[PDB]
Design an enzyme around this catalytic site. Structure first.
Site, PDB file in Angstrom:
ATOM      1  N   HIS A   2     -12.553   3.956   3.714  1.00 31.41           N
ATOM      2  CA  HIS A   2     -11.409   3.920   4.644  1.00 31.41           C
ATOM      3  C   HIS A   2     -11.889   3.561   6.040  1.00 31.41           C
ATOM      4  O   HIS A   2     -11.403   4.105   7.036  1.00 31.41           O
ATOM      5  CB  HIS A   2     -10.629   5.249   4.602  1.00 31.41           C
ATOM      6  N   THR A  29      -3.408   4.236  -2.118  1.00 31.43           N
ATOM      7  CA  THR A  29      -4.517   4.803  -1.363  1.00 31.43           C
ATOM      8  C   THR A  29      -4.805   6.200  -1.879  1.00 31.43           C
ATOM      9  O   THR A  29      -3.922   7.079  -1.886  1.00 31.43           O
ATOM     10  CB  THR A  29      -4.197   4.847   0.114  1.00 31.43           C
ATOM     11  N   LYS A  42      -7.271   2.425  -4.004  1.00 29.14           N
ATOM     12  CA  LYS A  42      -8.056   2.115  -2.826  1.00 29.14           C
ATOM     13  C   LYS A  42      -8.692   3.392  -2.293  1.00 29.14           C
ATOM     14  O   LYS A  42      -7.990   4.371  -1.995  1.00 29.14           O
ATOM     15  CB  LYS A  42      -7.134   1.504  -1.733  1.00 29.14           C
ATOM     16  N   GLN A  76       0.848  -1.185   0.000  1.00 30.39           N
ATOM     17  CA  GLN A  76       0.000   0.000   0.000  1.00 30.39           C
ATOM     18  C   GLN A  76       0.884   1.234   0.000  1.00 30.39           C
ATOM     19  O   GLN A  76       1.767   1.387   0.862  1.00 30.39           O
ATOM     20  CB  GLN A  76      -0.915  -0.040   1.211  1.00 30.39           C
TER      21      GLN A  76
HETATM   22  C1  LIG Z   1      -6.067   1.591  12.638  1.00 34.48           C
HETATM   23  C2  LIG Z   1      -6.223   1.665  11.165  1.00 34.48           C
HETATM   24  C3  LIG Z   1      -5.219   2.168  10.374  1.00 34.48           C
HETATM   25  C4  LIG Z   1      -5.325   2.250   8.972  1.00 34.48           C
HETATM   26  C5  LIG Z   1      -4.293   2.761   8.162  1.00 34.48           C
HETATM   27  C6  LIG Z   1      -4.412   2.726   6.771  1.00 34.48           C
HETATM   28  C7  LIG Z   1      -3.433   3.143   5.878  1.00 34.48           C
HETATM   29  O1  LIG Z   1      -2.325   3.611   6.262  1.00 34.48           O
HETATM   30  N1  LIG Z   1      -3.646   3.071   4.545  1.00 34.48           N
HETATM   31  C8  LIG Z   1      -4.834   2.612   3.996  1.00 34.48           C
HETATM   32  O2  LIG Z   1      -4.982   2.573   2.770  1.00 34.48           O
HETATM   33  N2  LIG Z   1      -5.814   2.214   4.849  1.00 34.48           N
HETATM   34  C9  LIG Z   1      -5.637   2.257   6.201  1.00 34.48           C
HETATM   35  N3  LIG Z   1      -6.636   1.806   6.966  1.00 34.48           N
HETATM   36  C10 LIG Z   1      -7.935   1.389   6.337  1.00 34.48           C
HETATM   37  C11 LIG Z   1      -8.035  -0.061   6.042  1.00 34.48           C
HETATM   38  O3  LIG Z   1      -7.150  -0.460   5.038  1.00 34.48           O
HETATM   39  C12 LIG Z   1      -9.416  -0.534   5.632  1.00 34.48           C
HETATM   40  O4  LIG Z   1      -9.889   0.332   4.574  1.00 34.48           O
HETATM   41  C13 LIG Z   1     -10.421  -0.472   6.742  1.00 34.48           C
HETATM   42  O5  LIG Z   1      -9.761  -0.997   7.945  1.00 34.48           O
HETATM   43  C14 LIG Z   1     -11.581  -1.475   6.356  1.00 34.48           C
HETATM   44  O6  LIG Z   1     -12.565  -1.509   7.325  1.00 34.48           O
HETATM   45  P1  LIG Z   1     -12.592  -2.620   8.492  1.00 34.48           P
HETATM   46  O7  LIG Z   1     -12.413  -4.044   8.024  1.00 34.48           O
HETATM   47  O8  LIG Z   1     -11.547  -2.202   9.488  1.00 34.48           O
HETATM   48  O9  LIG Z   1     -13.998  -2.327   8.956  1.00 34.48           O
HETATM   49  C15 LIG Z   1      -6.518   1.736   8.358  1.00 34.48           C
HETATM   50  C16 LIG Z   1      -7.496   1.193   9.169  1.00 34.48           C
HETATM   51  C17 LIG Z   1      -7.374   1.167  10.552  1.00 34.48           C
HETATM   52  C18 LIG Z   1      -8.431   0.586  11.301  1.00 34.48           C
END
Ligand SMILES: Cc1cc2cc3c(=O)[nH]c(=O)nc-3n(C[C@H](O)[C@H](O)[C@H](O)COP(=O)(O)O)c2cc1C
Ligand SMILES: Cc1cc2cc3c(=O)[nH]c(=O)nc-3n(C[C@H](O)[C@H](O)[C@H](O)COP(=O)(O)O)c2cc1C
Ligand SMILES: Cc1cc2cc3c(=O)[nH]c(=O)nc-3n(C[C@H](O)[C@H](O)[C@H](O)COP(=O)(O)O)c2cc1C
Ligand SMILES: Cc1cc2cc3c(=O)[nH]c(=O)nc-3n(C[C@H](O)[C@H](O)[C@H](O)COP(=O)(O)O)c2cc1C
Lengths: 332, 332, 332, 332
Positions: free
Chosen positions: C227, C152, C203, C124
């Site tokens: 996100h 992202t 994403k 990512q």
């Molecule tokens: C603590 C935490 C840090 C990040 C850091 C990032 C990130 O640096 N780059 C990125 O591109 N997406 C992130 N995310 C989103 C993740 O990748 C997902 O989009 C969601 O977690 C999906 O939803 P859940 O399965 O959690 O409901 C995060 C999600 C959580 C909970």
């Protein structure tokens, strides 16, 4: 009292629990009782602004008489359960407020006594054990000066009142059916229509085709109603059928609605959906229980104030203008 | 008992918690279990008034026999878990009420014993380890006088029952599968259809195209069902697919529904959406747990009273008339 | 553990409150965080019956590799916050389960170390302070054997995390961004696409036209995502845009979805709405917090069991068949 | 303070209960007050990604002046009820934030004093006992440098405030209407329009035809509004009429909205539904009650930060771009 809910709280404090439950309850799971309120809560009015409000009037003409508000007191049985003066207290307050009062076939004071109070008495009919007796009861009401026959069409028998079953509720010995049944059909309606020149109003219509048939049958009105949720549990609220019914009859009879009207704003919603008038049941009995005739007077004065307030805020100088308002369903 | 919920409360008091959970539970998060109830609660009936109710009848003809109500007892496994007389108590009460009883492949009393009670026994089939054994089980049921084969089509394997996992639930040593699996396909259906002249009823159909294929396959009926929320967690309720399925089969087989039927009013809703009949599962077991055969008798008498009440209040002298009622979705 | 919610409870018990809040929280009022769950709960699957389930497989081919399930571990920053082994524990369990693991630009162990674990590592990317540095980071990931670049696109800056503000949350000194920003545009996407032959996956796409533009831009996939409710508070859930997006791209790239996936049944709903695969974020971190690598292994084994169960109960021998299932919205 | 709800909690702690209720309350059952919030909560934004955010600006041009945000302080009567500096504190903070402040006809400091603070003062008009007095009040506002006349059109009289009735609320002797009514009509609007070259903005429009008539009448703007739920109880929220109204006027005047705006994300939703700008009422008074001028400054800085955050996360470098965002209704 500044809302009808103040009256409910006062009535709950004073009435024996089993009598409060007789009044409040519905049939079965009370799904239709609750849905009457939910259905009104989801309707929102689109008010108009900047209209002339020099002479706002809440009056209507219905069944050949001017009424002070687009509302009548619904037929509620056995009103001596709620206060010793029963129907006489309610009818006196309705007369003084200019509001029609519907005398019940199951009244705890005779229809002739209640009619002697004056005012605009209507008479609610249940079909009796035969045609001859039924028509004699219609003729009593007519001879006593009642001005409409409100034929209840949704009680081939009374529904299943689980609160009454659970409480083992029965009428006290001091309350009786002072005017003293088989299921009504369209033939019964025609027998009544031919027996009186009074307008016949069919109360308990929910299907669009039944509203059309009521007009074809010579009804002067209908009340779109699920009997306050007391009859078929799962029957649609009247307020959810009202607009479609008003369109289908297309002015051929008056279209009233009841179930859950608890404010002047709810009156305004009913009129904006096309009702000619509403009936109000339980709140009138809360006021009777709370403070007798004076309680009913206070309720009717409060409803009049709320109706005038809601109409003027919505830009309506008359009830006809309120019927031309548009509505929008919302999510509550 | 004045409602089916009275029976649930009584059964919860008497049954061991893990057995109550075996009965009450669904798969996964129980989303489909809850949705069966939510879906029924959102349906409202538009009743008809003023129809002839001289001879209201709740009877239907189905699979070549008259039934007293548009309902059968659903197949529920291992009924000795709930009362020592198990399936015999339930079958005796169903026979005396004129209601068909579905004997389960996983019954805790043999199918021949239950069939000897008399009445209208149907037999629910799970596909066995091979075709030969499966068909021998069909032939046992037929030889014992069962009148329909209810082939369950939604259990390639049993779903994930988290309550049973959490409780560590297992059958007591005193409860066994007294008639003693591989996943069924359309070929299995054809093998059953060619092996018996009894009507084959496919239980667990939710997709419209599967209902159409069931008719093409020679099924005499289907049960539109998510298995009481016990199979796929997230499967649509049967009541939400029923109307579309009834339109697609267009009289080519009987269309039953189950899941969450808890009153005669719910029976009326199912019939107004087009069902030929309903199945009822958990409530019958609540009655069995609460009071044995007499408990089941009381439940069936209560349901009969509720069905007759709801039909008459809705203007229906027959189940066919109830199928012509219209409904409206509401927001609860 | 028999559900993903068991893992949430275990993680809440062990983690410091401020770290649990960093993981659980969303931006603003958390409206989008909650809506991710509500949106999944309103979807119901219409399962098919009687299909051949002899060889049910949960495998998919995506970005040139077979994956054991239609799921990957979402990029989650700073995994040493949750367990001392951080990203290495998660990547080892994902490798052993055959599930792709997305290495975060903000990982607390270097991307080369995590890639050396093996498995199917994706990388990512956050766009860096300039094009040259950004592309060097892409080339590091490619040189280390990452198989896709998950760019992202919904973080021009991180959203407003009120729990973190209220807790005064900051990284402990022992957690750092071990790989060590300006907002990305379509020009940034083209710079990445020209710099690598790896598939570029955008994403954070929610608008239909942005999904179409992603295909036109040469993306090999998109993740339909808000996100996890951490970016725009009030952004629509990805699951509510998924079907319209899948129709608009009409096979031109892989379409993944994330946000709120909490069971194999939720995976099935996503696939029935047209997703190629899902990402799962928070639950993987709950398992890591609860029991390290072995916790992640147990979660992935549980999800695999739930996905196979849901697919077979719905009549699907392959993920492609699950994408052809129909759904119905319900009211929860 | 990191959210507007922090300010509500602080204001509730400091204000006398009856003054808090004067501020918080609505008319009747408060159905419209609650619906203003529910309506915003059901709207979700579909953000755009990967757009140039080099120079994000929250500024707009409206009524001939640049404003720093697409928002103005709504007219709220009697602000000395909330803090001793009343309107002067609020107007000073609005001026310093570059946000227009609407001076109320019922201000507790004279309009000339508030206008002398500077900034962008608008003046809210209630129609007075006659045309001559009304127009003199318009001319005072114009002579004092007010830049728009916000004619309130939804108060032929004030609604029924049950909290104020129940509390027996009255103005303390130390709070007066420092600028010192008959119902307004379209003729009143024309009298105002001919008396001033300032833009006339009609506040309280909900019907589409009234919005069209406002343009035909020469209004420079409208505020789509149910008066914060304080006027007709059961009036539709402005946010539910906004999109239809914006389409019907088709650029012929500015279209503002108010009611329930509680974050920059709510501002973004309003703009995505087509609003030119919003008004914010209660939260500004919470900040005034909590900490005077500095409290209002902090609120406006917080709202500015939230608006910029929401716009950029949604891919909008300008308010015009935010008006081109699409939305989707969800179920909360
Ligand atoms: C603590 C935490 C840090 C990040 C850091 C990032 C990130 O640096 N780059 C990125 O591109 N997406 C992130 N995310 C989103 C993740 O990748 C997902 O989009 C969601 O977690 C999906 O939803 P859940 O399965 O959690 O409901 C995060 C999600 C959580 C909970
Ligand atoms: C205790 C009680 C007795 C009756 C007896 C009758 C009756 O012998 N005939 C009839 O035709 N309608 C009745 N009704 C229905 C009534 O006339 C109105 O339909 C509903 O009260 C309107 O709903 P609410 O205003 O109460 O919500 C009753 C309502 C209540 C509460
Ligand atoms: C404890 C329990 C065991 C079984 C075993 C079977 C079975 O071996 N075969 C079958 O074909 N259906 C079953 N069922 C489903 C049943 O037949 C009805 O589909 C649902 O009970 C209808 O929903 P409810 O009336 O209970 O809401 C069961 C239901 C319950 C509760
Ligand atoms: C205590 C209080 C007094 C007034 C007096 C006035 C007024 O003399 N003229 C007018 O034209 N609008 C008023 N309003 C409505 C206001 O201007 C906004 O319409 C709503 O406050 C927007 O909703 P919120 O932001 O408060 O939810 C008021 C609102 C509140 C709360």
């Amino acid at each position: 009292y500044v809302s009808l809910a103040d009256l409910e709280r006062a009535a709950r404090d004073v009435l024996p629990g089993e009598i409060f439950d007789f009044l409040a309850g519905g049939s079965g799971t009370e799904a239709s009782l609750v849905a009457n309120r939910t259905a009104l809560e989801r309707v929102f009015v689109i008010p108009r602004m900047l209209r002339d409000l020099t002479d706002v009037t809440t009056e209507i003409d219905i069944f050949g008489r001017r009424a002070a508000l687009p509302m009548a007191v619904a037929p509620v049985a056995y009103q001596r359960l709620f206060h010793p003066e029963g129907e006489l207290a309610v009818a006196r307050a309705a007369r003084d407020a200019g509001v029609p009062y519907t005398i019940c076939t199951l009244s705890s004071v005779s229809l002739e006594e209640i009619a002697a109070v004056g005012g605009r008495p209507w008479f609610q009919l249940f079909w009796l054990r035969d045609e001859k007796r039924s028509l004699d009861l219609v003729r009593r009401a007519e001879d006593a000066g009642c001005e409409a026959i409100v034929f209840t069409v949704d009680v081939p028998w009374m529904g299943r009142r689980l609160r009454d079953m659970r409480n083992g509720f029965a009428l006290p010995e001091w309350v009786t059916a002072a005017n003293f049944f088989a299921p009504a059909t369209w033939e019964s309606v025609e027998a009544v229509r031919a027996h009186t020149d009074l307008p016949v109003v069919l109360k308990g219509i929910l299907a669009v085709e039944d509203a059309r048939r009521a007009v074809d049958a010579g009804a002067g009105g209908i009340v779109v109603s699920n009997h306050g949720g007391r009859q078929l549990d799962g029957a649609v609220p009247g307020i959810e059928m009202l607009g479609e019914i008003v369109a289908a009859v297309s002015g051929g009879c008056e279209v009233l609605v009841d179930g859950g009207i608890r404010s002047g704003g709810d009156v305004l919603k009913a009129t904006a959906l096309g009702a000619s008038a509403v009936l109000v049941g339980r709140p009138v009995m809360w006021a009777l229980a709370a403070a007798g005739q004076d309680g009913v007077r206070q309720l009717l004065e409060l409803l009049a104030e709320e109706v005038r307030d809601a109409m003027g805020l919505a830009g309506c100088e008359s009830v006809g203008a309120a019927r031309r308002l548009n509505t929008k369903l919302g999510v509550v």
